[PDB]
Amino acid sequence: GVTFDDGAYTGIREINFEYNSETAIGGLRVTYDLNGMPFVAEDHKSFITGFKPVKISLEFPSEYIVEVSGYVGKVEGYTVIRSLTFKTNKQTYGPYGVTNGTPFSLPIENGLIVGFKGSIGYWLDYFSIYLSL
Amino acid sequence: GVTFDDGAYTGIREINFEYNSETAIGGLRVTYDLNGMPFVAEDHKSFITGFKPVKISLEFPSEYIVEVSGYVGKVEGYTVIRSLTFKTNKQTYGPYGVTNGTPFSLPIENGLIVGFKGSIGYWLDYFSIYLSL
Amino acid sequence: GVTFDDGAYTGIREINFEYNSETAIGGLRVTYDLNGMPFVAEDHKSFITGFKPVKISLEFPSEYIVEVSGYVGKVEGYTVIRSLTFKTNKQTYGPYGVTNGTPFSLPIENGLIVGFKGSIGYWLDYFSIYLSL
């Protein structure tokens, strides 16, 4: 897939991503906070179509991501992120996608998710997270 | 003066500010780096005119600010920043303005100046700096 | 179990922990680096015996932990850490314990593991990690 790297910002206001209950996670675009103002980052699209879009608008700054988890599995022979669920201090969004494969979780006791990077082809290949106080 | 707060970014690519060899420092606008791309912040202008503009373009990222110093004094009864000099790992820019009053210096052994905030009326009233690794 | 919190230090020089190939992870004691000198933290022991001790001495500072993974499962009805493997930029230590249950992994692209906290009764109940630049 095509690699991407949003970099680091001051927080997260909204997350938009696609999913297919038959396959895996597709594209994604994040709206970060940048010193008090919304900042929409580059849209990272899937090479294909047929996904359902989910939009998660956080009640910034009172609401922030407290945990990220999901499953990684193989689709058409490619190892991709098949499901995602975001836990907030207010509520839980997900899971979305196929919860089959190897699970993973990143609970946070102290700190903030402040950026994303990764790779997307037909589906989300992999991703990493920026952390900060 | 009118207070301002640029917030924090990933670095500094260019600094633009005004000075009057008779009075003090005037307005200023900073071009920050934001995850590898130039980001021009709000222009913070003086309430008056008659200044000389100085533009400092840093050879980002090989060149970064290593020290900030200057003098604070009274002009027309107001306590303002009358002079500024920026020390880089490559060279020294300044001093600019009137080097009369109380000197101040912020040398940095490890770390980066990553943002500015302060207040400007007729002249630069005061400022603070964001620091980060 | 009894909760513990080593706090944060400047790095890690050595990790000592117990494991039982039949049950789960037992006690553990970490030797941190503190501004260039070894600092041995409190020994957090299991409520029982019958474990094998493993000592991982890192070639500090050239060698540092690059990834932590393992499995969490139930033993005698308690949910505990049953296995652990530490990936270093030099080599891999593990896995140790029973690799049965829910896997978890914490790969690090940039940053250092700089402290531990958690709970230990008969076995390691759970743990969290301190991260830092």
């Binding site: 920026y130 952390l131 | 840093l58 690794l133 | 690090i108 630049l133």
Partner: peptide, 16 residues
């Protein structure tokens, strides 16, 4: 050592 601010990055997840 340059003028770029460093960040703590955890991951990736997607090759497991």
């Amino acid at each position: 050592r340059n003028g770029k601010s460093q960040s703590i990055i955890v991951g990736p997840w997607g090759d497991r």
